[PDB]
Design a protein around this ligand. Structure first.
Ligand code: VBV
Ligand code: VBV
Ligand code: CL
Lengths: 242, 242
């Protein structure tokens, strides 16, 4: 069911990095990883939590559709793409934290806890601040737990409307060409050690889907593109993408 | 409403070709084309009909979802990608006619005719074989009529469920990167003169969507790649994509 391939560590060492990549072959019901232990260690989800947060806001009517505009609050922040109006698509694409903090406040603690319990998401713990617990609160999730959550979403099995799940999967769209489709979400856990970069999602092929969940040590923002670079190197090594 | 911009004709003359490109700026509600007459000339839709065909098959339950596998019927045909099992996603990607002919036969002429009238689709005529009328029957649609149909699909305003429209828009996914998303459908009218190629769809940006419908003279299959190349050069010139 699960099997270890330490050859992938070469792609992390090439960049003075350390992390885990978890792959799940859906047709084969078989998984692969370079580090079985780290694959099952739980971290703050950071902005990968925007996937469940989006599903919850949509199912509860906090967000009516993927076109609804959440207007900039006028506060100029460090990330320039945040200083503008957004909808669900662009809020996801640029990980616009302030938009999702507003979602979390509207959802509230009671509804957020009950939804995460129904999702079986990570340790299901929302302890901490209602609008920041996924960045510095008590919630934790492993790479394999991310995949288990992503598989339910792919098959429309979560306890939200199929419509909510289809909208979030549209918003997760990251890349598409004649060879594959990638639906994924980045994340960067900075507030609580150890600082890690996330990348979770899946690769749609003609005949199959490969779910993936990776995280890696990330001491600064400069290495964030290594998330994408290293995952693709593993995908290329395993003959999943050309 | 429509502004003629015949500088685009340069992009057709470079490649020994002739045709029309039609653009619709959704935010501004203004349209652009290099040839208003041809923009309103109605042709056989060819495999661009796979968009309404998909919508009807899904709304009637002929297609359960985008994952349902439709087995190869065993007959080896000239296009190698057709000689395999398909789902809705890959049947649209590779324009697998025999799969959609089976859809059309199950839909039947009565429901096909009723649905195209509800869709306001072209001249709404399905005379000929129910499983080939978009290739050699009486149906005709112009580039501007493709735009108006696609605009309803984008806004979920066609007379089918929101679910069917979301699934078909997912299946139209052609290309996606950090700059744009293209949902579109190719078509090649081969059986009745004039032989023409189609490309219809839209380009999703952060802040806007640009609908497009193009067709061009296509006497040989060697020029089919010019549909996307010419369209993209127009999009590049208009600063829609980089
Ligand atoms: O602590 S702040 O509230 O100012 C903060 C700033 C930035 C981020 C951030 C960074 C990168 C990414 S992503 O590259 O992984 O998508 C996602 C989110 C999170 C929190
Ligand atoms: O007449 S046949 O039944 O043998 C036939 C053969 C080929 C095609 C065809 C060709 C190209 C494209 S596409 O490049 O626009 O996607 C779509 C469809 C249609 C019918
Ligand atoms: Cl999509």
């Amino acid at each position: 069911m699960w099997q270890e391939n330490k050859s992938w560590n070469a792609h992390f060492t090439e960049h003075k990095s350390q992390g885990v990549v978890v792959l799940w072959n859906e047709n084969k019901q078989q998984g692969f990883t370079n580090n079985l232990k780290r694959a099952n260690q739980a971290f703050l989800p950071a902005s990968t939590f925007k996937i469940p947060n989006s599903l919850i806001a949509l199912d509860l009517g906090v967000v009516k559709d993927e076109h609804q505009v959440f207007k900039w609050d006028g506060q100029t922040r460090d990330i320039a793409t945040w200083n503008r109006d957004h909808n669900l698509i662009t809020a996801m694409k640029y990980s616009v934290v302030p938009v999702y903090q507003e979602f979390a406040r509207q959802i509230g603690e009671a509804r957020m806890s009950k939804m995460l319990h129904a999702f079986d998401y990570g340790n299901e713990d929302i302890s901490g601040n209602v609008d920041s617990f996924w960045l510095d609160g008590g919630i934790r999730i492993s790479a394999t737990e991310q995949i288990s959550f992503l598989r339910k979403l792919y098959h429309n099995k979560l306890h939200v409307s199929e419509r909510s799940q289809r909208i979030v999967k549209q918003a997760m769209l990251t890349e598409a060409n004649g060879d594959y489709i990638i639906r994924a979400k980045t994340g960067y856990s900075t507030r609580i050690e150890p600082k890690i970069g996330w990348w979770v999602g899946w690769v749609e092929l003609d005949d199959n889907v490969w779910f993936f969940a990776m995280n890696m040590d990330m001491p600064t923002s400069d290495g964030l593109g290594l998330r994408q670079a290293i995952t693709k190197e593993v995908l290329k090594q395993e003959k999943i993408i050309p």
